Chain length 489, copies 4
């Protein structure tokens, strides 16, 4: 293995698991085994929780500004170690260094930096009832919470979940994807170095079926925050609910629509469509994988998309000139190729890619070509199902209401966007689209200030923005009676 065996992180330090079992993480660029990683046992989970319990007491006992200064220090360390964390993330995900150096840690730390500044602003309410009585509310920490991470943006997700949790005075136990465990451990180190009390951010590695489930079931954990497929999200939420009525946050899948209206600049529209489909090799939940184009612009639009896709620079993620890397794993590559086959079988016209890239050294990695399908139909498998790979489906429409009805016609509802120059149409259309994340004349930007999450089966709750920080506290109302008490008895 390229690295030494990875251990659990409990109580401000690495500790041995008690499972006697490990798993491997695999560089998707070349098949290389990067490291063996220990599997948390059930008792290791018990251990993490007890550690989390005592750590949270220390963390919550500090002042708001003390917590804020510690989180800001972590932000500083993240900025310093940006390029080094990125390089690790690139080995572990296959994502191009050009992305990991500029997006993953930068935007992960952005959210942490945002919340660090907001600790002192968490406030309750005061309500006068009458001269002899009033109420005040407190926003108290939940206590111990758990985050279960996804494999497309491992460290960013760990940051987006842990930042609000810690800022609100909680301790978090985090479980990275078994697929991408490496950077989460590094984040734990950084928190500890920043001054976060032992136990406040612990990392447990292992599978979702086991340690993931052991966390969602644990009676001492107060909330679960999950990021993954909708199918898994349902199991996780039910488990969290039926075990001990935990609060939950679910960021799940989508099949998000992008509608190009007939007055759009086609150069901008194509730039948006390719970004909404091919960044991180198509492994972004909010991707605009259903692209609606008006009949009158279909030929020009396809030509413009084609031209951009052709010049995509697929290659070794270590090469700074690469802007399109392999997929995250070989099994995931197989999944994508199956969907691609589905599209061919169902008679969608293949415009670009549509197969594995095996030339030379690429055969050793999980490379799928940037693929565009056109002449698609709403009932095709590639159009209904989330592919989570580099697969664009182009759908022609004739009028606005049709485009909107079709965009909305899905059980998903994470993101949606429109391209248009007309003031009234932009707002009108976005107001009718059933998604939590809506973009006008852009795609993919997710400011720390902007609450993001899904409508329908694409999620529950939100991340980022002031509202997310509020939902990592619980409300206690205190009624103070200053006068008499009357009893009917």
């Amino acid at each position: 293995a390229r690295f030494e065996e990875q251990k659990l992180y409990i109580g401000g330090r690495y500790v041995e698991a008690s499972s006697g079992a490990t798993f491997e993480t695999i560089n998707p660029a070349n098949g290389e085994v990067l490291a063996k990683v220990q599997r948390a046992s059930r008792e290791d989970v018990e251990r993490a929780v007890q550690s989390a319990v005592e750590g949270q007491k220390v963390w919550a006992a500090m002042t708001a500004m003390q917590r804020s200064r510690i989180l800001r220090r972590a932000v500083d360390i993240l900025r310093e170690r940006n390029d080094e964390l990125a390089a690790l993330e690139t080995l572990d995900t296959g994502k191009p260094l050009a992305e990991t150096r500029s997006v993953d840690i930068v935007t992960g730390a952005d959210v942490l930096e945002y919340y660090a500044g907001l600790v002192p602003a968490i406030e309750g309410e005061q309500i006068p009832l009458r001269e002899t009585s009033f109420v005040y509310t407190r926003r108290e920490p939940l206590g111990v919470v758990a985050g279960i991470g996804a494999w497309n943006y491992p460290v960013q997700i760990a940051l987006w979940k842990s930042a609000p949790a810690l800022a609100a005075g909680n301790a978090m136990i985090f479980k990275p994807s078994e697929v991408t465990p490496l950077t989460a451990l590094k984040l734990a180190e950084i928190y500890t170095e920043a001054g976060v009390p032992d136990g406040v951010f612990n990392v447990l590695t292992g599978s979702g079926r086991e340690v993931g489930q052991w966390l969602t079931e644990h009676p001492l954990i107060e909330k679960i925050s999950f990021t993954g497929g909708t199918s898994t999200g349902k199991k996780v939420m039910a488990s969290a609910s039926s075990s001990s009525l935990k609060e939950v946050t679910m960021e799940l899948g989508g099949k998000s629509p992008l509608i190009i209206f007939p007055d759009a600049d086609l150069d901008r529209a194509a730039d948006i469509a390719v970004m909404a489909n091919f960044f991180s090799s198509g492994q972004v939940c909010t991707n605009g994988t259903r692209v609606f184009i008006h009949r009158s612009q279909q030929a020009r639009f396809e030509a413009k998309v084609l031209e951009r896709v052709q010049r995509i620079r697929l290659g070794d993620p270590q090469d700074e000139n690469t802007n399109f890397g392999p997929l995250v794993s070989f099994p995931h590559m197989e999944s994508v190729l199956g969907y691609i086959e589905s599209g061919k079988a169902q008679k969608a016209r293949l415009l670009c890619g549509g197969e594995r890239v095996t030339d030379g050294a690429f055969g050793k990695g999980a490379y799928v070509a940037p693929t565009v399908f056109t002449d698609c139909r709403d009932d095709m498998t590639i159009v209904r199902e989330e592919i989570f790979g580099p697969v664009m489906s182009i759908l022609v429409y004739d009028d606005e209401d049709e485009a909107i009805r079709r965009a909305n016609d899905t059980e998903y509802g994470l993101a949606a966007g429109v391209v248009t120059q007309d003031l009234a149409r932009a707002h009108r259309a976005i107001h009718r689209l059933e998604a939590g994340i809506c973009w006008i004349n852009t795609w993919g930007e997710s400011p720390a200030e902007m609450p993001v999450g899904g409508y329908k089966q694409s999620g529950v709750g939100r991340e980022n923005g002031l509202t997310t920080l509020a939902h990592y506290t619980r409300i206690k109302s205190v009624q103070v009676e200053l006068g008499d008490y009357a009893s009917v008895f």
Copy 2:
């Protein structure tokens, strides 16, 4: 039966169920059959959902102030029919006329009145990102929601659930408990009379063994609001989660602690304890059923409690002088007596009552005497488990930290209260008590402005207050890009 057969309420009128089944509702004061009530079929749930979907569109297309005025009109009618509705609730619940006339509809209407005033204040946010881009959020209705009521406060709960839901522009399908179906049907008539559009408040009758489940599982229902026992709640929330990832609010059970500190006025403390245990014959979720008294004061406090309990006026709920009625149902009485038996069996000292009242006309009702146990211990069943009847457990303690530690030692966390004249101790203690509803020197008052709900397994989410209104909307974030768009490809 006293009344005609009760039908379903869908689309602004009564319609015939399609189940071929009915169930009875019984006056618990005398075993009289009040009415046969039709059971919704699964196809009837579907019919109520489609009706709600169409109604919600009409409702949400009105202006905020139009919705506000309509809800304000429903409040006026409720004020007019307070006594008439109270009488009907008394028949159905066995609760004394003295209670239903001054609490149930009054405080139900209080909350509707409160939310009616707030419809025009539901706002989103606007966030500048830079000169060429900003975001704004919309707080959009969820759409169709379901409420599931409990049997202790049927109409009040229907109001507490439907008011925020409708205020926020949703339609609600409501299922009263099969034990108390009558007043919810009246509420539906009233909304229609006030101008609420057809389909916006539909009522489905049945039980948790069917229609309840059909509601929590329906794919087109976006949120479940549930009030009931913790054990049922866990089931409900799991079904709500796994079926279609619904949002949920759960108001569940409690074993709420009332700590009487040594400096307390024992007359007030006694008053608070009796109110916290015997109002609505002990059928209040937030009841203070574990009463901690300091050892130095145990003798004195037990005498003051005894004196009040002795003069409780148990009797026919129809008599205005009655302030303690029978229980809601005979099966519920059996459950309660079971617990009282447990108390005796585990050697707690019976101070008061402890049996069914069967003298004269009472033998035909479900009357359980006001019961007080003392010399209790934390491992007794009557102390760990919610009884939801007239059973107070008095527990001796020695120091402040011990009382609080014990008060907190429960999976429950609905309410908690302290009685004390000391400024510091009142706040110090209340801040350390793990409950969502905290009372200082009083008990049971639940203003429309005060968010209420449980910590731990006593609930998820809140009812009443500003925050609850927000939780009947979903957030959509809109990013408007006014400048250039940059692609890496």
Copy 3:
């Protein structure tokens, strides 16, 4: 006179002034004497303050929902008497019935209705400092506040000032314009009938020089809210400041820019421009009296404006078909005619109107034709100075940045608007315009939810919206120390 002598309104009824003096209010349509009106003396002011102080105590002692219900009852009476009140406002202002029946009372009552609903939502904050200390804030009533009104929307202004004041638990002493005293007194009657305690809304008539100033100087009045000209506002604000440091709201004049961009529909642009100049005979503070048109569209725009202006129905305000009435007074007409003369003398090109209309019955009143000057320049008197009459100035520009720079080149800053179909231009332009009230593709609408007020010399503070309610309370911060106090001594 048409009506009996109008007396002061103090403490829930009419009382004789103690000045020995009166003035007359005149119908501007025909010069008819509507009423003798009493002038409040200095002692009457003192009487109204003492009344207000006592009434405020009763008002604030009520609960939030009690106040809310009384204000709602006032709304109901206003809706009932809309037409009768409009008729009176038309007599007093000369504004067409078609306007007074549908705008003045409707939108005045809209704002009262909005705030009535919000009374229970006024809340302070709670902030934990450490385990042994926290703070909570109270938003307490200011106490007694004064409103000074203007003559163009007399009752609407009285409502827009008294609604938030009373909703926040204050008492208001209101001084309507000497020019238009009649409807303010009716409002005071209506408040009383709705159940507003005696003293809570008192009305003093007289001049600004005397009674207005006595109000702004009185040591027991905590806030002044004024609507009028910028020049007068400076005096009033200085006086409120130096006397006793009162809080202030100032709604003043403007010279608001309307920018029509080259991609605008010119029919919509012309509709907007005429509505923004000729409603209430040009006597609206937020009027868009500087209208910027691109050089390439000048001729077509003028033709469209001219076509609409030609069909304006100047006439007797009592006639329902009239949509353009006389000005409020003969002296105000003289002022407006002076500006019109200035425009001719400085060589602006007269497109429409530009003179008094004296034909037939119009000679009895103060009627100025709707007037349009074009080929204007920035340095012209009519372009620099608020005219407050029916005088539109059309200005030609060549580029967007030029238009915006010129629109901002003024000491005023009340309103601004753009007409454009382009998404990016609409927001970009509005964001750069230095005014508090900004309209895109519309003009003049002022929803109860929307904070309105001026930038620069056009105002201080705001009216309407959530923010305004807050500004009629004062913040008290309360720190509770629960632990030890330390002294350096």
Copy 4:
């Protein structure tokens, strides 16, 4: 002089004034000249305003987080240089090193640190009106604002005013008291070093009569924030109003009541009373200078206060062991000595101090002994008028309501405090006290989170907290019309 001649700070550097005039700043501990300081001319004000206009544009064009980082860096520098800055403040004010090292910069930086974290959280609102129209508000910077400082807490005031101003994206021109100009200039250096753009924080030195007034009058300055005496505040506010209608914040004087109730611990009470009267040698605006003691406790309270005052360590502010320094200036000492004479003359009983301390080296400084008057009456000059020196007035009362009535019997209303162990009394009394800053069982703590300012003639607006940040912005409302526009013409 001890230091070189101090110049103006404009555009991120020192520049020569153009008045040709200087003034001296004097160490009050020994009468020695610390520095000659330049007087800004009228043209220097203009220069500073132009500098600020251009600076503000650079500042506002950065992103929220960029501003946040810059201010956080300033905080870091201020922490590094705490002792050095404290030493300069001690020279300039005469305040003990023990105070300045732990209070002045510490709490100045706290507030800056607080606001730096809140920059990204400044948001507007979004309000839907109907399907075809919505509004959003923007909270835009005011632009250029001016702060005018007092002499008791020079650098802390400069920080409390500049922090929210800059955090909200404004440029501030600041004018320190002529009495204490030194630390403000240092602050400007630190802001520049931290990366604040040139012009964003400019410092002009001179007299309030001249430069101060030139700032309140300048047409381009949008807001004045002032701290000082009520009498001066009125003139400043009048000038800011009549010149260009500026927005204002005024933090003025007071005669704040401290009410010791009979159940209070007299040791704590005495500790609080002395701290509320003798910290910073009595030069604290919020000082509890009227101390109310129940008659039954007068003798004992006097004893306890006497014992504490006698051990007060008056001496050289350079001595770490000194905790009571000289007054800020010789003319100020003279004023205080006058008030003390008045006290003696009006027959209040002198319990302590009551004269200048001239022993040894003290005769070269402006030392007044800690002074306690008892047997005071409400009509005594020392009880009615703010002394702003080390003079406590003890007042006896017989009942709660009398004490509260007398506490409120003043045109002032800055602070108030009660001492009591009773829950009800604590909150009940404080809710009835007419002051903006209320303390229970403590005094003097002013956390960044807590809004502080005066009722009545003690102030306008507030500083710190979340509310203050809002008030360094102006609200712009934007209505977007997406549908048709209707004209009556």
